[PDB]
mmCIF file of C-alpha atoms in Angstrom:
data_model
loop_
_atom_site.group_PDB
_atom_site.id
_atom_site.type_symbol
_atom_site.label_atom_id
_atom_site.label_comp_id
_atom_site.label_asym_id
_atom_site.label_seq_id
_atom_site.Cartn_x
_atom_site.Cartn_y
_atom_site.Cartn_z
ATOM 1 C CA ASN L 761 42.678 -128.701 -16.137
ATOM 2 C CA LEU L 762 39.987 -126.190 -16.457
ATOM 3 C CA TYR L 763 41.250 -126.065 -20.063
ATOM 4 C CA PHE L 764 40.356 -129.799 -20.559
ATOM 5 C CA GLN L 765 36.955 -129.035 -18.993
ATOM 6 C CA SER L 766 36.254 -126.069 -21.172
ATOM 7 C CA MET L 767 33.469 -128.182 -22.821
ATOM 8 C CA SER L 768 32.235 -129.871 -19.606
ATOM 9 C CA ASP L 769 28.817 -129.143 -18.044
ATOM 10 C CA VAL L 770 30.292 -129.001 -14.489
ATOM 11 C CA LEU L 771 33.715 -127.763 -13.373
ATOM 12 C CA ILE L 772 35.276 -130.066 -10.747
ATOM 13 C CA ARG L 773 38.646 -129.118 -9.172
ATOM 14 C CA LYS L 774 40.590 -128.151 -6.077
ATOM 15 C CA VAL L 775 41.463 -124.610 -5.410
ATOM 16 C CA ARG L 776 43.762 -124.177 -2.351
ATOM 17 C CA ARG L 777 41.935 -125.791 0.660
ATOM 18 C CA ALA L 778 38.639 -126.410 -1.160
ATOM 19 C CA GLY L 779 37.082 -128.870 -3.471
ATOM 20 C CA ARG L 780 35.197 -126.777 -5.986
ATOM 21 C CA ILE L 781 32.086 -127.589 -7.964
ATOM 22 C CA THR L 782 30.815 -124.996 -10.430
ATOM 23 C CA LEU L 783 27.816 -125.783 -12.624
ATOM 24 C CA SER L 784 28.928 -124.590 -16.147
ATOM 25 C CA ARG L 785 25.872 -124.899 -18.373
ATOM 26 C CA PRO L 786 24.273 -121.465 -18.082
ATOM 27 C CA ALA L 787 22.537 -121.717 -21.474
ATOM 28 C CA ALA L 788 20.289 -124.497 -20.101
ATOM 29 C CA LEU L 789 20.018 -122.778 -16.749
ATOM 30 C CA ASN L 790 22.475 -125.350 -15.361
ATOM 31 C CA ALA L 791 19.963 -128.115 -15.649
ATOM 32 C CA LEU L 792 21.217 -131.382 -14.298
ATOM 33 C CA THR L 793 22.062 -134.325 -16.435
ATOM 34 C CA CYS L 794 22.857 -137.914 -15.403
ATOM 35 C CA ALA L 795 26.527 -137.238 -16.223
ATOM 36 C CA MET L 796 26.820 -134.157 -14.095
ATOM 37 C CA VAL L 797 25.226 -135.906 -11.148
ATOM 38 C CA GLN L 798 27.623 -138.893 -11.578
ATOM 39 C CA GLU L 799 30.640 -136.582 -11.720
ATOM 40 C CA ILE L 800 29.637 -134.510 -8.758
ATOM 41 C CA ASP L 801 29.024 -137.571 -6.640
ATOM 42 C CA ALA L 802 32.413 -139.169 -7.670
ATOM 43 C CA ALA L 803 34.200 -135.913 -6.815
ATOM 44 C CA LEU L 804 32.609 -135.632 -3.426
ATOM 45 C CA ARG L 805 33.288 -139.301 -2.672
ATOM 46 C CA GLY L 806 36.983 -138.861 -3.534
ATOM 47 C CA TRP L 807 37.278 -135.704 -1.452
ATOM 48 C CA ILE L 808 36.170 -137.549 1.730
ATOM 49 C CA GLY L 809 39.633 -139.079 2.126
ATOM 50 C CA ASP L 810 41.669 -136.288 0.573
ATOM 51 C CA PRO L 811 43.359 -134.390 3.438
ATOM 52 C CA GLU L 812 44.083 -131.438 1.178
ATOM 53 C CA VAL L 813 40.327 -130.840 0.974
ATOM 54 C CA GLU L 814 39.206 -129.009 4.076
ATOM 55 C CA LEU L 815 35.771 -128.000 2.683
ATOM 56 C CA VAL L 816 33.663 -127.973 -0.541
ATOM 57 C CA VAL L 817 32.119 -124.904 -2.154
ATOM 58 C CA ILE L 818 29.348 -125.415 -4.754
ATOM 59 C CA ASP L 819 28.425 -122.524 -7.092
ATOM 60 C CA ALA L 820 27.227 -122.005 -10.655
ATOM 61 C CA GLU L 821 27.715 -119.779 -13.695
ATOM 62 C CA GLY L 822 25.253 -117.252 -14.970
ATOM 63 C CA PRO L 823 23.103 -114.706 -13.269
ATOM 64 C CA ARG L 824 19.701 -116.290 -14.045
ATOM 65 C CA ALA L 825 19.992 -119.618 -12.173
ATOM 66 C CA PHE L 826 21.992 -121.606 -9.741
ATOM 67 C CA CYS L 827 20.186 -124.635 -11.184
ATOM 68 C CA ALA L 828 16.645 -124.772 -12.534
ATOM 69 C CA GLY L 829 16.014 -128.508 -12.304
ATOM 70 C CA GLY L 830 16.813 -131.869 -13.812
ATOM 71 C CA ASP L 831 17.232 -132.021 -17.571
ATOM 72 C CA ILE L 832 14.173 -134.161 -17.781
ATOM 73 C CA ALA L 833 13.287 -134.097 -21.457
ATOM 74 C CA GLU L 834 15.779 -137.149 -21.520
ATOM 75 C CA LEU L 835 13.292 -139.066 -19.410
ATOM 76 C CA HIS L 836 10.006 -138.626 -21.452
ATOM 77 C CA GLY L 837 11.379 -140.264 -24.656
ATOM 78 C CA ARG L 838 12.998 -143.232 -22.878
ATOM 79 C CA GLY L 839 9.739 -143.404 -20.944
ATOM 80 C CA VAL L 840 6.516 -143.318 -23.032
ATOM 81 C CA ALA L 841 8.360 -146.019 -24.984
ATOM 82 C CA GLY L 842 8.154 -148.371 -21.895
ATOM 83 C CA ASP L 843 11.830 -147.906 -20.807
ATOM 84 C CA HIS L 844 11.115 -146.738 -17.210
ATOM 85 C CA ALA L 845 14.588 -148.025 -16.182
ATOM 86 C CA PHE L 846 16.377 -144.830 -17.389
ATOM 87 C CA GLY L 847 14.472 -142.608 -14.860
ATOM 88 C CA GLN L 848 14.685 -145.202 -12.067
ATOM 89 C CA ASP L 849 18.428 -145.440 -12.409
ATOM 90 C CA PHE L 850 18.916 -141.697 -12.677
ATOM 91 C CA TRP L 851 16.926 -141.016 -9.486
ATOM 92 C CA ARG L 852 18.861 -143.698 -7.702
ATOM 93 C CA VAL L 853 22.212 -142.074 -8.295
ATOM 94 C CA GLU L 854 20.790 -138.584 -7.787
ATOM 95 C CA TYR L 855 19.301 -139.401 -4.425
ATOM 96 C CA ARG L 856 22.597 -140.971 -3.345
ATOM 97 C CA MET L 857 24.360 -137.744 -4.173
ATOM 98 C CA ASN L 858 21.769 -135.723 -2.281
ATOM 99 C CA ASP L 859 22.384 -137.915 0.742
ATOM 100 C CA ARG L 860 26.198 -137.627 0.227
ATOM 101 C CA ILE L 861 26.004 -133.914 0.350
ATOM 102 C CA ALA L 862 23.694 -133.836 3.387
ATOM 103 C CA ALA L 863 25.795 -136.006 5.616
ATOM 104 C CA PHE L 864 29.181 -135.009 4.179
ATOM 105 C CA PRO L 865 31.906 -135.208 6.915
ATOM 106 C CA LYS L 866 33.498 -131.940 5.865
ATOM 107 C CA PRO L 867 31.883 -128.494 5.625
ATOM 108 C CA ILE L 868 29.978 -127.795 2.353
ATOM 109 C CA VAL L 869 28.938 -124.208 1.360
ATOM 110 C CA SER L 870 26.388 -123.644 -1.360
ATOM 111 C CA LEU L 871 25.932 -120.155 -3.060
ATOM 112 C CA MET L 872 22.697 -120.083 -4.959
ATOM 113 C CA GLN L 873 21.852 -117.068 -7.194
ATOM 114 C CA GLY L 874 18.678 -116.746 -9.213
ATOM 115 C CA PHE L 875 16.406 -119.651 -9.822
ATOM 116 C CA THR L 876 16.904 -122.887 -7.750
ATOM 117 C CA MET L 877 14.180 -125.486 -8.365
ATOM 118 C CA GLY L 878 13.728 -129.255 -8.531
ATOM 119 C CA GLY L 879 17.053 -130.980 -8.786
ATOM 120 C CA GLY L 880 18.717 -127.735 -7.960
ATOM 121 C CA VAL L 881 17.312 -127.840 -4.469
ATOM 122 C CA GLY L 882 18.895 -131.299 -4.154
ATOM 123 C CA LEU L 883 22.200 -129.958 -5.035
ATOM 124 C CA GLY L 884 22.359 -126.802 -2.986
ATOM 125 C CA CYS L 885 19.803 -126.944 -0.187
ATOM 126 C CA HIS L 886 21.310 -129.878 1.668
ATOM 127 C CA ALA L 887 24.637 -128.242 2.188
ATOM 128 C CA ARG L 888 25.682 -127.318 5.703
ATOM 129 C CA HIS L 889 26.036 -123.583 4.814
ATOM 130 C CA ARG L 890 23.631 -122.330 2.243
ATOM 131 C CA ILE L 891 23.939 -118.781 0.998
ATOM 132 C CA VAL L 892 21.294 -116.808 -0.839
ATOM 133 C CA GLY L 893 21.511 -113.385 -2.429
ATOM 134 C CA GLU L 894 19.316 -110.746 -3.836
ATOM 135 C CA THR L 895 18.235 -112.605 -6.980
ATOM 136 C CA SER L 896 17.586 -116.038 -5.283
ATOM 137 C CA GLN L 897 14.171 -117.579 -5.906
ATOM 138 C CA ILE L 898 13.612 -121.168 -4.720
ATOM 139 C CA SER L 899 10.624 -123.372 -5.416
ATOM 140 C CA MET L 900 9.502 -127.034 -5.850
ATOM 141 C CA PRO L 901 7.079 -126.989 -8.625
ATOM 142 C CA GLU L 902 7.032 -130.746 -9.219
ATOM 143 C CA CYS L 903 3.309 -131.400 -8.743
ATOM 144 C CA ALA L 904 2.588 -129.191 -11.790
ATOM 145 C CA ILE L 905 4.370 -131.897 -13.831
ATOM 146 C CA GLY L 906 2.972 -134.973 -12.121
ATOM 147 C CA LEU L 907 5.775 -135.643 -9.661
ATOM 148 C CA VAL L 908 6.252 -135.184 -5.931
ATOM 149 C CA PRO L 909 9.036 -132.891 -4.862
ATOM 150 C CA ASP L 910 12.045 -135.169 -4.723
ATOM 151 C CA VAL L 911 15.799 -134.946 -4.233
ATOM 152 C CA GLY L 912 15.237 -134.642 -0.476
ATOM 153 C CA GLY L 913 12.783 -131.798 -1.127
ATOM 154 C CA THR L 914 10.292 -133.450 1.112
ATOM 155 C CA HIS L 915 12.733 -133.458 4.013
ATOM 156 C CA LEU L 916 13.132 -129.704 3.801
ATOM 157 C CA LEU L 917 9.392 -129.159 3.221
ATOM 158 C CA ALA L 918 8.503 -131.273 6.222
ATOM 159 C CA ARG L 919 10.810 -129.262 8.479
ATOM 160 C CA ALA L 920 9.486 -125.868 7.464
ATOM 161 C CA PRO L 921 7.479 -124.057 10.178
ATOM 162 C CA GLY L 922 3.769 -124.913 10.612
ATOM 163 C CA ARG L 923 2.147 -125.881 7.314
ATOM 164 C CA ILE L 924 4.470 -123.846 5.086
ATOM 165 C CA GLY L 925 5.869 -127.201 3.670
ATOM 166 C CA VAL L 926 2.388 -128.168 2.599
ATOM 167 C CA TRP L 927 1.778 -124.850 0.885
ATOM 168 C CA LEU L 928 5.191 -124.805 -0.852
ATOM 169 C CA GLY L 929 4.877 -128.391 -1.823
ATOM 170 C CA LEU L 930 1.372 -128.464 -3.154
ATOM 171 C CA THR L 931 1.445 -125.037 -4.817
ATOM 172 C CA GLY L 932 4.966 -124.636 -6.121
ATOM 173 C CA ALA L 933 5.128 -121.173 -4.458
ATOM 174 C CA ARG L 934 8.371 -119.125 -4.571
ATOM 175 C CA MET L 935 10.699 -118.206 -1.749
ATOM 176 C CA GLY L 936 12.970 -115.175 -2.029
ATOM 177 C CA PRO L 937 16.132 -115.080 0.152
ATOM 178 C CA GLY L 938 14.339 -114.014 3.365
ATOM 179 C CA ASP L 939 11.601 -116.617 2.995
ATOM 180 C CA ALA L 940 14.095 -119.376 1.920
ATOM 181 C CA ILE L 941 15.940 -118.790 5.272
ATOM 182 C CA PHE L 942 12.737 -118.610 7.298
ATOM 183 C CA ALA L 943 11.475 -121.807 5.719
ATOM 184 C CA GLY L 944 14.793 -123.604 6.195
ATOM 185 C CA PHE L 945 15.997 -123.890 2.595
ATOM 186 C CA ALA L 946 18.991 -121.735 3.236
ATOM 187 C CA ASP L 947 20.896 -120.251 6.191
ATOM 188 C CA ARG L 948 22.406 -116.795 5.350
ATOM 189 C CA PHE L 949 21.876 -113.827 3.183
ATOM 190 C CA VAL L 950 25.011 -112.297 1.610
ATOM 191 C CA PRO L 951 24.955 -109.598 -1.065
ATOM 192 C CA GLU L 952 25.919 -111.160 -4.441
ATOM 193 C CA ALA L 953 28.612 -108.503 -5.089
ATOM 194 C CA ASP L 954 30.438 -109.983 -2.111
ATOM 195 C CA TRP L 955 30.492 -113.540 -3.393
ATOM 196 C CA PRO L 956 33.781 -113.569 -5.413
ATOM 197 C CA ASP L 957 35.592 -112.354 -2.286
ATOM 198 C CA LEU L 958 33.751 -114.745 -0.037
ATOM 199 C CA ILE L 959 34.575 -117.747 -2.114
ATOM 200 C CA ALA L 960 38.255 -116.714 -2.325
ATOM 201 C CA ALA L 961 38.251 -116.497 1.479
ATOM 202 C CA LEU L 962 36.643 -119.901 1.718
ATOM 203 C CA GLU L 963 39.092 -121.421 -0.718
ATOM 204 C CA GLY L 964 41.738 -120.332 1.808
ATOM 205 C CA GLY L 965 39.945 -122.438 4.477
ATOM 206 C CA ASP L 966 38.428 -119.591 6.430
ATOM 207 C CA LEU L 967 34.867 -120.746 7.195
ATOM 208 C CA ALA L 968 33.697 -117.447 8.760
ATOM 209 C CA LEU L 969 30.615 -116.168 6.930
ATOM 210 C CA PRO L 970 29.574 -112.534 7.053
ATOM 211 C CA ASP L 971 26.466 -111.519 8.958
ATOM 212 C CA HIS L 972 23.700 -109.620 7.202
ATOM 213 C CA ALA L 973 19.903 -109.355 7.652
ATOM 214 C CA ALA L 974 17.956 -110.833 4.724
ATOM 215 C CA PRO L 975 15.317 -108.616 3.121
ATOM 216 C CA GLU L 976 11.990 -109.372 4.786
ATOM 217 C CA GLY L 977 9.750 -111.796 2.862
ATOM 218 C CA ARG L 978 5.995 -112.690 2.931
ATOM 219 C CA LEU L 979 6.154 -115.877 5.107
ATOM 220 C CA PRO L 980 6.295 -114.515 8.579
ATOM 221 C CA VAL L 981 3.045 -112.606 8.093
ATOM 222 C CA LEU L 982 1.345 -115.346 5.917
ATOM 223 C CA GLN L 983 2.161 -118.075 8.472
ATOM 224 C CA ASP L 984 -1.097 -117.968 10.462
ATOM 225 C CA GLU L 985 -3.318 -118.172 7.324
ATOM 226 C CA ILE L 986 -1.035 -120.892 5.850
ATOM 227 C CA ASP L 987 -1.501 -122.839 9.083
ATOM 228 C CA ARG L 988 -5.308 -122.548 8.965
ATOM 229 C CA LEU L 989 -5.768 -123.109 5.261
ATOM 230 C CA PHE L 990 -3.493 -126.181 4.806
ATOM 231 C CA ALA L 991 -4.607 -128.219 7.832
ATOM 232 C CA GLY L 992 -6.146 -131.567 7.259
ATOM 233 C CA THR L 993 -6.358 -133.565 4.029
ATOM 234 C CA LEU L 994 -6.949 -132.740 0.351
ATOM 235 C CA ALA L 995 -10.602 -133.545 0.862
ATOM 236 C CA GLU L 996 -10.778 -130.449 3.113
ATOM 237 C CA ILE L 997 -8.279 -127.998 1.828
ATOM 238 C CA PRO L 998 -9.764 -126.973 -1.586
ATOM 239 C CA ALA L 999 -13.127 -126.082 0.018
ATOM 240 C CA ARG L 1000 -11.386 -124.041 2.690
ATOM 241 C CA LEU L 1001 -9.449 -122.211 0.007
ATOM 242 C CA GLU L 1002 -12.586 -121.520 -1.955
ATOM 243 C CA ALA L 1003 -14.173 -119.813 1.050
ATOM 244 C CA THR L 1004 -11.214 -117.532 1.497
ATOM 245 C CA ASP L 1005 -11.143 -114.349 -0.636
ATOM 246 C CA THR L 1006 -7.459 -113.525 -0.384
ATOM 247 C CA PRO L 1007 -4.504 -113.507 -2.865
ATOM 248 C CA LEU L 1008 -2.901 -116.356 -0.833
ATOM 249 C CA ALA L 1009 -5.930 -118.625 -0.985
ATOM 250 C CA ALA L 1010 -6.760 -117.734 -4.587
ATOM 251 C CA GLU L 1011 -3.225 -118.299 -5.940
ATOM 252 C CA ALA L 1012 -3.124 -121.625 -3.990
ATOM 253 C CA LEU L 1013 -6.373 -122.824 -5.369
ATOM 254 C CA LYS L 1014 -5.349 -122.179 -8.958
ATOM 255 C CA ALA L 1015 -2.146 -124.155 -8.372
ATOM 256 C CA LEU L 1016 -4.167 -126.953 -6.892
ATOM 257 C CA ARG L 1017 -6.598 -126.990 -9.781
ATOM 258 C CA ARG L 1018 -3.886 -127.059 -12.401
ATOM 259 C CA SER L 1019 -1.572 -129.695 -10.864
ATOM 260 C CA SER L 1020 -1.702 -133.449 -10.874
ATOM 261 C CA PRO L 1021 -4.145 -134.604 -8.243
ATOM 262 C CA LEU L 1022 -2.227 -137.839 -7.628
ATOM 263 C CA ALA L 1023 1.066 -135.952 -7.157
ATOM 264 C CA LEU L 1024 -0.622 -133.465 -4.776
ATOM 265 C CA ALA L 1025 -2.144 -136.293 -2.710
ATOM 266 C CA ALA L 1026 1.102 -138.216 -2.564
ATOM 267 C CA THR L 1027 3.156 -135.097 -1.584
ATOM 268 C CA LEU L 1028 0.890 -134.475 1.291
ATOM 269 C CA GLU L 1029 1.023 -138.059 2.400
ATOM 270 C CA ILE L 1030 4.833 -138.076 2.280
ATOM 271 C CA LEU L 1031 5.021 -134.876 4.360
ATOM 272 C CA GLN L 1032 2.646 -136.376 6.942
ATOM 273 C CA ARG L 1033 4.719 -139.602 7.242
ATOM 274 C CA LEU L 1034 7.872 -137.664 7.559
ATOM 275 C CA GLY L 1035 7.044 -134.971 10.162
ATOM 276 C CA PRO L 1036 9.870 -132.587 11.182
ATOM 277 C CA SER L 1037 12.054 -135.097 13.002
ATOM 278 C CA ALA L 1038 12.856 -137.483 10.124
ATOM 279 C CA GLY L 1039 16.280 -137.704 8.489
ATOM 280 C CA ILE L 1040 16.969 -137.174 4.832
ATOM 281 C CA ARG L 1041 17.145 -140.882 4.050
ATOM 282 C CA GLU L 1042 13.531 -141.463 5.155
ATOM 283 C CA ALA L 1043 12.498 -138.792 2.769
ATOM 284 C CA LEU L 1044 14.605 -140.017 -0.199
ATOM 285 C CA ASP L 1045 13.222 -143.456 0.374
ATOM 286 C CA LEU L 1046 9.637 -142.287 0.264
ATOM 287 C CA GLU L 1047 10.271 -140.007 -2.724
ATOM 288 C CA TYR L 1048 11.828 -142.984 -4.580
ATOM 289 C CA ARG L 1049 8.910 -145.082 -3.893
ATOM 290 C CA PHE L 1050 6.789 -142.556 -5.817
ATOM 291 C CA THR L 1051 9.216 -141.677 -8.556
ATOM 292 C CA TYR L 1052 10.177 -145.336 -9.184
ATOM 293 C CA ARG L 1053 6.461 -145.933 -9.952
ATOM 294 C CA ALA L 1054 5.675 -142.548 -11.542
ATOM 295 C CA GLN L 1055 6.188 -143.250 -15.270
ATOM 296 C CA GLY L 1056 3.797 -146.192 -15.261
ATOM 297 C CA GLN L 1057 1.537 -145.486 -12.340
ATOM 298 C CA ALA L 1058 1.268 -141.699 -12.085
ATOM 299 C CA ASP L 1059 0.993 -138.528 -14.167
ATOM 300 C CA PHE L 1060 4.661 -137.731 -14.789
ATOM 301 C CA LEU L 1061 4.834 -138.522 -18.489
ATOM 302 C CA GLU L 1062 1.716 -136.571 -19.387
ATOM 303 C CA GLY L 1063 2.982 -133.764 -17.106
ATOM 304 C CA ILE L 1064 6.183 -133.541 -19.106
ATOM 305 C CA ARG L 1065 4.352 -133.715 -22.390
ATOM 306 C CA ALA L 1066 2.169 -130.753 -21.509
ATOM 307 C CA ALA L 1067 4.879 -128.523 -20.023
ATOM 308 C CA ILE L 1068 8.131 -129.494 -21.756
ATOM 309 C CA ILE L 1069 7.558 -131.461 -24.979
ATOM 310 C CA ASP L 1070 4.342 -130.225 -26.601
ATOM 311 C CA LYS L 1071 4.056 -127.110 -24.348
ATOM 312 C CA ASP L 1072 0.333 -126.966 -24.688
ATOM 313 C CA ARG L 1073 -0.113 -126.467 -20.847
ATOM 314 C CA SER L 1074 -3.096 -128.752 -21.099
ATOM 315 C CA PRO L 1075 -2.261 -131.816 -19.141
ATOM 316 C CA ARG L 1076 -4.972 -134.506 -18.957
ATOM 317 C CA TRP L 1077 -4.417 -136.097 -15.556
ATOM 318 C CA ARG L 1078 -5.525 -139.552 -14.305
ATOM 319 C CA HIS L 1079 -7.960 -137.759 -11.966
ATOM 320 C CA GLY L 1080 -10.298 -134.791 -12.358
ATOM 321 C CA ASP L 1081 -9.660 -133.242 -8.909
ATOM 322 C CA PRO L 1082 -7.590 -133.712 -5.644
ATOM 323 C CA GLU L 1083 -10.780 -134.671 -3.765
ATOM 324 C CA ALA L 1084 -11.165 -137.672 -6.136
ATOM 325 C CA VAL L 1085 -7.882 -139.446 -5.371
ATOM 326 C CA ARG L 1086 -8.482 -142.741 -3.474
ATOM 327 C CA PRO L 1087 -6.299 -143.260 -0.273
ATOM 328 C CA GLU L 1088 -5.663 -146.844 -1.431
ATOM 329 C CA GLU L 1089 -4.118 -145.483 -4.590
ATOM 330 C CA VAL L 1090 -1.753 -143.183 -2.668
ATOM 331 C CA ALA L 1091 -0.883 -146.104 -0.416
ATOM 332 C CA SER L 1092 0.099 -148.225 -3.415
ATOM 333 C CA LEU L 1093 2.317 -145.520 -4.832
ATOM 334 C CA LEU L 1094 4.015 -145.121 -1.493
ATOM 335 C CA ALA L 1095 4.260 -148.781 -0.556
ATOM 336 C CA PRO L 1096 7.676 -150.409 0.098
ATOM 337 C CA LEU L 1097 9.552 -151.263 -3.054
ATOM 338 C CA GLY L 1098 10.972 -154.478 -1.566
ATOM 339 C CA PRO L 1099 13.902 -155.562 -3.642
ATOM 340 C CA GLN L 1100 13.853 -152.400 -5.756
ATOM 341 C CA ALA L 1101 14.054 -150.215 -2.594
ATOM 342 C CA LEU L 1102 16.476 -147.317 -2.491
ATOM 343 C CA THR L 1103 19.747 -148.185 -0.768
ATOM 344 C CA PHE L 1104 22.894 -146.386 0.363
#
């Protein structure tokens, strides 16, 4: 019943021909908990064999946010205390779900209003048909908290044209609906006033999606400068930014200066290993390597303390600048996990 789920953080049900997932926690911007991720993945798994399910539609309540990230305050407590296992387990099931969505045998449509960041990208941006609207703003601002973009984030980042993945990934920069499409985080623009009808039509198993131009964004014209500025390694990029008196370069440099140098360096290294041709599992695997080690070996806990727990915005990172991160140290964070390796 939807009545029996009137206190649940995600609404899971079939409506006509469609399995339906609606995030129902708008007061916390639909932030993802362990329990929600478990429930979504169970539902999807069970819909594989159900012949009444011809497709899945994923949506969310509230006008502010499809889904603004993982509910990660959970993870700092059970974390600075030495219990790294909570985060490790959570990421394991999350990344499995991200993979389940990506390779799902039946069509999945995502409709993502407002803010989609972090875990939210994992939930919506691997669907086969990803719809954005007028209020849609998508970013991966993980490095600002001492993590790499995860949940398959790196797969999408690596596939974006030229060096746009680098820029998005190291700076946490926003994409509106036009730029999300251009960059490959979504497929179609559809006005948000049309969405109740669209979803009804989809519930009836009609997979036709209406054709509209997205509003133009900044990426097509920024592409050339993105491609010049974000070439090479982190030993080269900050100096190139400093020489460039433009809003683009200046906003990027501030992001670089504020974020965890270790997370920046690892993000770049993941993107470089991946390239555009890799599948989602390569990416999840590399992300897990970092995130499995992040609580004890990287800046994640201090990142969360600064931004989420104490809110002083004054993180004290393991390194003083991106230029100072040793390659050997990135290599260790991204080394195979052996028996702890992610599996499907």
